[PDB]
Design a protein around this ligand. Structure first.
Ligand SMILES: [Mg+2]
Ligand SMILES: [Mg+2]
Lengths: 145, 146
């Protein structure tokens, strides 16, 4: 749907169990390039949501238009304020399968080395999927930048 | 020093006071493009070192060569095993970058006292990599030129 990089992203929160806790992985995916940002948070309040959104912006750049579900955090005024501050249109699966690839990569890296910190695994997965996996022949990173 | 993006990085840890504590900002900067990665950690051990380096790789790409000081973390065996495992050359053969970031932090936290440190760090990165024009290019543009 996005016509170029950073036109439209889709975002969701998905869950992942690590050493007994069920973490919130805040996920952003660019609908043109497929490039992805994931941030491991403990919860899904507006603070964590904005926090993970800012991290995605450092990774991918600032999007024109983001699409989400009707989650409370996305509908909160804190988040609406952020969006307006940043000049981002906000409206209410590419995500489901992107999620799938990330989780299979965390499961693999954790099987190989059980004591791997969750952050390392997430950053290894992000680098693999964005920058290594070829799709035309291009990586998501190439098409993004 | 680096001849194209991701040829040679420099990294260092530097200190930043926020509220009570003295935080470790693990900084990696690409010597060709300028592009920067910064990870806020509570300490400067090999765990924290490796973690911050993986975040940088996810932000920046994998470098061929890294230059660091002689700090404990960098000389440890966990760090050396990470490097060889990733085909990164490491030597012990930045301070201006550290200064530009800390100045953006200070400015951000002066305008809004409650702004979380992590958000300030990510706002800085985005500004410094993708907004500041230098050449007439940003660091990001140079970093991603094929
Ligand atoms: Mg949801
Ligand atoms: Mg030092």
């Amino acid at each position: 749907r996005g016509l170029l990089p950073n036109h439209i992203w889709q975002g969701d929160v998905t869950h992942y169990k690590y050493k007994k806790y069920k973490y919130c992985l805040h996920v952003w995916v660019d609908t043109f390039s497929g490039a992805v940002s994931v941030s491991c948070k403990k919860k899904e309040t507006s603070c964590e949501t904005i926090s993970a959104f800012l991290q995605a912006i450092s990774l991918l750049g600032k999007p024109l238009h983001i699409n989400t579900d009707n989650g409370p955090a996305f509908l909160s005024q804190e988040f609406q304020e952020f969006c307006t501050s940043y000049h981002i249109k906000h409206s209410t699966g590419l995500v489901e399968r992107t999620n799938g690839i990330i989780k299979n990569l965390l499961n693999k890296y954790l099987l190989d080395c059980p004591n791997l910190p969750l952050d390392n695994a997430i950053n290894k997965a992000l680098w693999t999927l964005n920058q290594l996996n070829v799709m035309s022949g291009k990586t998501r990173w190439q098409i993004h930048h």
